[PDB]
């Protein structure tokens, strides 16, 4: 109604979305969420943007996981709005692991910067890249504070990150996946 706040165990909004191209469907394709979600499969959404820090730092992580779990679940990689927008002028006084990016202004900018990330980051093709639309309805949909993790399975929240200081914890991630793989 007036604000969004959505919940462990709920539907998983089905937001709208676009393509980001990750090759080995036509880029910028417009799609939704749960299109990447596929049977019983757990579907791994990783919600962030080349400025937030403690996203970028953890996407080496998210490789990993990709790599040792991608047989048995979907991942996707949805690029928000910038966490810290780029003025152009200040020079980070410290080597920095990630890079800058101004604020979007339109679409075509923020799939750009979606682009960047994969390149410096070395996402494979089967971390499938989505940027959110203008409108940023998968931001508000899925109550991320600059960056979140929420696994999607049977059409439902699964697992959905919190809000205390070090709830953003992709081995958590692996816990949940190791927890759903097991006997």
Partial sequence: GAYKQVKL???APNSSVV??????????AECH??????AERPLVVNFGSATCPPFTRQLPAFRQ???EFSSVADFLLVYIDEAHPSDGWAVPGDSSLSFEVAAHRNQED??????QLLERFSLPPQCQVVADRMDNNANVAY???????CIVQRRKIAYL???GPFSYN?????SWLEKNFSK
């Fill in 9 to 11: 165990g709920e539907d």
């Fill in 170 to 174: 992709l081995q958590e991630v692996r």
């Fill in 161 to 163: 990150g919190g809000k």
């Fill in 110 to 115: 923020r799939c750009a910067a979606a682009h």
């Fill in 33 to 38: 969420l749960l299109d990447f979600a596929s």
């Fill in 143 to 149: 109550g991320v504070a600059f960056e979140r993790v």
């Fill in 19 to 28: 393509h980001v191209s990750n090759p080995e469907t036509a880029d910028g």
């Fill in 65 to 67: 996981l990709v790599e």
